[PDB]
């Protein structure tokens, strides 16, 4: 009886397997979207720092 009860709980864990998958999949999708927005963030940051270094150069010759 304890063994049959044990068998059923394993079955519970078995289907739970997919439930363990869900949190990992949401975390994966969060990493997805964060990296995708980091793409344009990096590009805009590169443009901004190029402008900043341009201002640095003009102030350099200005002194």
């Amino acid at each position: 009886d304890i063994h049959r009860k044990r068998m059923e709980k394993d079955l519970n864990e078995l289907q739970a397997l997919i439930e363990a998958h869900f949190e990992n999949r949401k975390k994966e999708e969060e990493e997805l979207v964060s990296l995708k927005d980091r793409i344009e963030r990096r590009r805009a940051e590169r443009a901004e720092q190029q402008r900043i270094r341009n201002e640095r150069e003009k102030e350099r010759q200005n002194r």
Binding site: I52, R56, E59, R63
Partner: protein, 56 residues
């Protein structure tokens, strides 16, 4: 005195830039290290599964 003031202004600008870039580097550094920690974890675990293939 005027020239000294202009040069001091430019130097302070540059130094604040230094500090801000250092902080940005810090944040990026921590994120990259954590990324590689979890990368090596998932790689080792894929290898462990392959070890499972060997046990089978």
């Amino acid at each position: 005195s005027d020239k000294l003031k202009e040069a001091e202004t430019r130097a302070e600008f540059a130094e604040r830039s230094v500090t801000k870039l250092e902080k940005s580097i810090d944040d990026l550094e921590d994120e990259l290290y954590a990324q590689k920690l979890k990368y090596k974890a998932i790689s080792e675990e894929l290898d462990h599964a392959l070890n499972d293939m060997t046990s089978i």
